[PDB]
Amino acid sequence: TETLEIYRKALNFNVIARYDPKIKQLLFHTPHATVYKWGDDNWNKLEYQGVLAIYLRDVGDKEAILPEVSSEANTPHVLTGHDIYNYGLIIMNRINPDNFSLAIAPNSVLNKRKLFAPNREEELEPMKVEVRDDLVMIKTLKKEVYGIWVHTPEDRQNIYELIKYLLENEPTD
Amino acid sequence: NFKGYQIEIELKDGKRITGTLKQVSPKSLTLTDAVFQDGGVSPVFKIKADKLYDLKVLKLPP
Amino acid sequence: SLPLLRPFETVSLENAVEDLVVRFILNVPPEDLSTVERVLFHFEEASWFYTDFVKLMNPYLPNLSIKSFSKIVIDICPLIWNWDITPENALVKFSNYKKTIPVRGAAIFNDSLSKILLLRGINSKHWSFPRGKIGKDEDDVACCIREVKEETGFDLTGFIDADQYVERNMNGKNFKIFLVKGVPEDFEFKPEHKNEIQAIEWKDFKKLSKAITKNEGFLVNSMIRPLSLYVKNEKRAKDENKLKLYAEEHLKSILGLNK
Ligand SMILES: C[n+]1cn([C@@H]2O[C@H](COP(=O)(O)OP(=O)(O)O)[C@@H](O)[C@H]2O)c2nc(N)[nH]c(=O)c21
Ligand SMILES: [Mg+2]
Ligand SMILES: [Mg+2]
Ligand SMILES: [Mg+2]
Numbered sequence: 001t002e003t004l005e006i007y008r009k010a011l012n013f014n015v016i017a018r019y020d021p022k023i024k025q026l027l028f029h030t031p032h033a034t035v036y037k038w039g040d041d042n043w044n045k046l047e048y049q050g051v052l053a054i055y056l057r058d059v060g061d062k063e064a065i066l067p068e069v070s071s072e073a074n075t076p077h078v079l080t081g082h083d084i085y086n087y088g089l090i091i092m093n094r095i096n097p098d099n100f101s102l103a104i105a106p107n108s109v110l111n112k113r114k115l116f117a118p119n120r121e122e123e124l125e126p127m128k129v130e131v132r133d134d135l136v137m138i139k140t141l142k143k144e145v146y147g148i149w150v151h152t153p154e155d156r157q158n159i160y161e162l163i164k165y166l167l168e169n170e171p172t173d
Numbered sequence: 174n175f176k177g178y179q180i181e182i183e184l185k186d187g188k189r190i191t192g193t194l195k196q197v198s199p200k201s202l203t204l205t206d207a208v209f210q211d212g213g214v215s216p217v218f219k220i221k222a223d224k225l226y227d228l229k230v231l232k233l234p235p
Numbered sequence: 236s237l238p239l240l241r242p243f244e245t246v247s248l249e250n251a252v253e254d255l256v257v258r259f260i261l262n263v264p265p266e267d268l269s270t271v272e273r274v275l276f277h278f279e280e281a282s283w284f285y286t287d288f289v290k291l292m293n294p295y296l297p298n299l300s301i302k303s304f305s306k307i308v309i310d311i312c313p314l315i316w317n318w319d320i321t322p323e324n325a326l327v328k329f330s331n332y333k334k335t336i337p338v339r340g341a342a343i344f345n346d347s348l349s350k351i352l353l354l355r356g357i358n359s360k361h362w363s364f365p366r367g368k369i370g371k372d373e374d375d376v377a378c379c380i381r382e383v384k385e386e387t388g389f390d391l392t393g394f395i396d397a398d399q400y401v402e403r404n405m406n407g408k409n410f411k412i413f414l415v416k417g418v419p420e421d422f423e424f425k426p427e428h429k430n431e432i433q434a435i436e437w438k439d440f441k442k443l444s445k446a447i448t449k450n451e452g453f454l455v456n457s458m459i460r461p462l463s464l465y466v467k468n469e470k471r472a473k474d475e476n477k478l479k480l481y482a483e484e485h486l487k488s489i490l491g492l493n494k
Contacts, residue, residue: 175482199489222490230483
């Protein structure tokens with residue numbers, strides 16, 4: 001009835017909650033995606049295929065830190081430092097055990113952090129989102145360009161607008 | 174030697190000539206049943222090395 | 236970018252299921268929920284993932300065959316099994332169901348055309364072709380490319396001629412095997428999936444004909460004459476071209492004002 005979906009909601013949460021323990025609330029989930037990455041002025045195929053999910057991340061604590069996973073451009077640069085990254089992205093990789101992650105910090109409270117406390121570890125590049133060539137083009141906080149594919153055009157343009165609504169509207173509740 | 178090999182000859186003036194080869198000499202090329210992309214079919218063509226532009230070897234002999 | 240913790244080295248078979256369920260089954264489009272045969276394809280993927288990575292990192296964890304696994308998967312999440320069918324009977328339906336799904340493969344030949352690339356699968360001893368069952372709504376050539384890349388680590392794209400195949404129907408299973416020429420033999424043909432292909436090698440075409448003609452005991456034992464004809468029509472053409480090439484290579488220097 002709906003008990004088949006409340007469980008689906010809880011289980012979708014609790015499982016992601018083990019990869020990312022700071023999930024205040026899951027935003028949504030589209031069951032098909034494939035990561036592509038802009039290399040030699042072309043888009044290359046990446047081993048992450050599976051359910052896409054954007055969630056609200058608890059941010060949190062004054063000194064909450066992001067620990068390191070136990071082990072040239074082909075590799076995305078791990079996010080080290082303080083916990084500021086308000087929202088997150090995950091592709092529950094059906095391929096291999098490791099999953100795809102993009103920390104989505106609002107372009108609003110990004111400059112707010114890096115100029116009040118000018119103590120800069122990494123240079124967070126205000127994330128950009130657009131749609132071109134049946135791909136949701138996402139420029140990342142560390143200059144890399146990742147494009148994800150959904151079969152449905154409604155799904156491709158729904159995740160887009162939301163990704164914008166996060167980096168544009170300030171994080172309030 | 175190269176007799177029987179149907180060859181195609183492209184010319185820079187704007188003309189193209191097909192036809193099967195009859196005589197090969199480094200100064201002159203002669204064709205049997207030369208068909209031209211201008212609407213002319215001739216059974217004997219003689220052309221010199223200097224007045225020639227592009228070449229392709231269309232078919233081999235039977 | 237954002238750093239995530241690997242929860243799979245030390246994990247409870249209980250929480251390993253809950254994980255895998257969200258990864259594969261639980262979160263899929265209701266169009267792949269139409270049949271029981273539909274959902275059991277995820278259970279098949281999930282079980283292959285469990286025994287490919289989960290059981291790897293967890294020595295202590297059981298060894299789970301699709302039978303046991305899928306049967307456990309329901310014990311943990313009963314809200315995923317909707318229909319009043321036992322996963323025992325439902326899995327034998329699935330196995331017999333698979334036996335109808337048509338295979339699309341390839342005949343991998345080198346520029347030389349003396350040798351053909353053939354693979355043998357883990358459990359078996361019979362040499363056959365890189366080949367697999369079609370997916371949901373995917374064209375014959377695309378399924379061939381997906382299946383040949385998965386089996387040999389080669390993207391066939393370039394050499395895939397669409398009207399140049401070989402079709403045969405062996406026991407209610409449609410085989411459509413494309414004819415590919417120009418493949419490089421030096422490249423390392425490692426498969427991309429664990430526990431599917433045992434050995435991959437270049438068996439010499441002539442050798443095979445001579446042994447097939449003896450009748451001993453391969454889809455190649457039915458597509459023999461079509462394959463031989465294709466080779467004949469290809470060596471014939473590739474060499475006819477090197478006769479025309481030399482006829483040209485000599486004209487473009489005996490007269491030819493080559494640049
Ligand atoms: C991709 N996959 C294929 N199998 C094996 O390969 C067999 C055939 O499975 P198939 O993928 O349905 O056939 P296809 O290759 O013709 O498309 C199965 O019975 C398994 O033995 C697999 N076995 C394991 N353990 N892991 C995998 O990832 C895997
Ligand atoms: Mg196969
Ligand atoms: Mg296969
Ligand atoms: Mg398959």
